[PDB]
Amino acid sequence: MSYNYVVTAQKPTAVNGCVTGHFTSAEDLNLLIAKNTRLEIYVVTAEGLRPVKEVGMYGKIAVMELFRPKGESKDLLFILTAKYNACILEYKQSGESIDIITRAHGNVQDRIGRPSETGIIGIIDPECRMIGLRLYDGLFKVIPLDRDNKELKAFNIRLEELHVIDVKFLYGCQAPTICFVYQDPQGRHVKTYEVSLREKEFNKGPWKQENVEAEASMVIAVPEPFGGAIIIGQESITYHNGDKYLAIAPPIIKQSTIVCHNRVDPNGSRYLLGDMEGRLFMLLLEKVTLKDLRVELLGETSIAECLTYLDNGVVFVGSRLGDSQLVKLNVDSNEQGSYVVAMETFTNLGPIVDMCVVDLERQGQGQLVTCSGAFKEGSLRIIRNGKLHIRTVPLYESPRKICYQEVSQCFGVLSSRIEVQDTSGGTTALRPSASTQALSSSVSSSKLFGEEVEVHNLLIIDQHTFEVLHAHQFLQNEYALSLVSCKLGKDPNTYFIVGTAMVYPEEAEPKQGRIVVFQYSDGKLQTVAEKEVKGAVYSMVEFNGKLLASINSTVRLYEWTTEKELRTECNHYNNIMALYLKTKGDFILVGDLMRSVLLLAYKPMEGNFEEIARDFNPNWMSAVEILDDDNFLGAENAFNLFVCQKDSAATTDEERQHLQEVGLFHLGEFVNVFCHGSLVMQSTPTQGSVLFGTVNGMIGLVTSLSESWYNLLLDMQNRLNKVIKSVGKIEHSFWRSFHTERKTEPATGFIDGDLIESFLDISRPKMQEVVANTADDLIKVVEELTRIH
**Which positions touch other proteins (CB under 8 A)?**
16-17, 62, 115, 117-119, 163, 165-166, 183, 187-188, 214-215, 217-218, 257, 259-260, 305-306, 320-321, 351, 353-354, 374-375, 398, 400, 479, 503, 505-506, 508-510, 575, 577, 579, 593-594, 618-620, 622-623, 637-639, 670, 672-673, 695, 741-742
β-bridge pairing 258-263 and 270-275: antiparallel
**Could you give the 3-state DSSP secondary structure of residue 754?**
helix
CA neighbor of 699 nearest in space, from 708, 689, 709, 707: 689
Nearest approach, Cβ of 325 to other proteins (angstroms)?
17
CB atoms within 10 A of CB 664: 19
Nearer to other proteins, 339 or 620 (CB): 620
Nearest approach, Cβ of 498 to other proteins (angstroms)?
15
Residue type, 106: G
147 Cα distance to chain centroid: 37
Nearest approach, Cβ of 702 to other proteins (angstroms)?
18
Nearest approach, Cβ of 226 to other proteins (angstroms)?
23
Nearer to other proteins, 416 or 485 (CB): 416
Nearest approach, Cβ of 630 to other proteins (angstroms)?
26
The answer to whether residues 603 and 582 touch, using CB atoms and an 8 Å cutoff, is no
Nearer to other proteins, 256 or 660 (CB): 256
The answer to whether residues 20 and 309 touch, using CB atoms and an 8 Å cutoff, is yes
Nearer to other proteins, 639 or 735 (CB): 639
Nearer to other proteins, 232 or 469 (CB): 232
Residue type, 160: E
Nearer to other proteins, 272 or 306 (CB): 306
Nearest approach, Cβ of 534 to other proteins (angstroms)?
12
372 Cα distance to chain centroid: 11
Query: For residue 81, what is the enclosing H or E element?
Result: strand 76-81
Residue 356, strand partner residues: 369
Nearest approach, Cβ of 402 to other proteins (angstroms)?
11
CB atoms within 10 A of CB 532: 12
Nearest approach, Cβ of 596 to other proteins (angstroms)?
8
Nearest approach, Cβ of 582 to other proteins (angstroms)?
14
**Could you give the 3-state DSSP secondary structure of residue 616?**
strand
CA neighbor of 614 nearest in space, from 640, 570, 642, 576: 576
Nearest approach, Cβ of 409 to other proteins (angstroms)?
26
Residue 554, strand partner residues: 551
Cβ-count burial of 23 within 10 angstroms (0-12 exposed, 13-18 middle, 19+ buried)? buried
* Rounded CA separation 7/490 (Å): 42
Nearest approach, Cβ of 418 to other proteins (angstroms)?
10
Nearer to other proteins, 117 or 361 (CB): 117
Query: For residue 734, what is the enclosing H or E element?
Result: helix 732-735
* Rounded CA separation 639/742 (Å): 14
Taking phi over 0 as left and psi of -120 to 50 as alpha, with beta for the rest, 213 belongs to beta
* Rounded CA separation 741/116 (Å): 12
* Rounded CA separation 412/461 (Å): 7
Nearer to other proteins, 577 or 690 (CB): 577
Q: From edge to edge, which strands make up the β-sheet containing 237-240?
A: 218-221, 229-232, 237-240, 245-248
* Rounded CA separation 752/705 (Å): 12
Nearer to other proteins, 293 or 579 (CB): 579
Nearest approach, Cβ of 354 to other proteins (angstroms)?
7
Question: For the chain, what is the total number of helices (H) and then of strands (E)?
Answer: 6, 65
* Rounded CA separation 374/448 (Å): 32
Nearer to other proteins, 257 or 330 (CB): 257
Taking phi over 0 as left and psi of -120 to 50 as alpha, with beta for the rest, 67 belongs to beta
Nearest approach, Cβ of 234 to other proteins (angstroms)?
10
**Could you give the 3-state DSSP secondary structure of residue 781?**
helix
The answer to whether residues 379 and 373 touch, using CB atoms and an 8 Å cutoff, is yes
Nearer to other proteins, 259 or 724 (CB): 259
Residue type, 334: N
Nearer to other proteins, 282 or 638 (CB): 638
Nearest approach, Cβ of 20 to other proteins (angstroms)?
18
* Rounded CA separation 60/52 (Å): 22
* Rounded CA separation 206/173 (Å): 9
Nearest approach, Cβ of 428 to other proteins (angstroms)?
19
Nearest approach, Cβ of 277 to other proteins (angstroms)?
13
Nearer to other proteins, 128 or 594 (CB): 594
327 Cα distance to chain centroid: 23
Instruction: Specify the DSSP class assigned to residue 489.
Output: T
Nearer to other proteins, 425 or 618 (CB): 618
Residue 419, strand partner residues: 429, 453
Residue type, 776: D
Nearer to other proteins, 298 or 321 (CB): 321
CA neighbor of 134 nearest in space, from 188, 180, 70, 194: 180
Nearer to other proteins, 137 or 754 (CB): 137
Nearest approach, Cβ of 181 to other proteins (angstroms)?
9
* Rounded CA separation 634/623 (Å): 6
Nearest approach, Cβ of 464 to other proteins (angstroms)?
27
Nearer to other proteins, 59 or 510 (CB): 510
* Rounded CA separation 338/325 (Å): 17
Q: Write phi, then psi, for 428 (nearest 5 degrees).
A: -140, 135
Task: Give the alpha-carbon dihedral of 185, 188, 193, 199, to 10 degrees.
Answer: 20
Nearer to other proteins, 202 or 479 (CB): 479
Taking phi over 0 as left and psi of -120 to 50 as alpha, with beta for the rest, 607 belongs to left
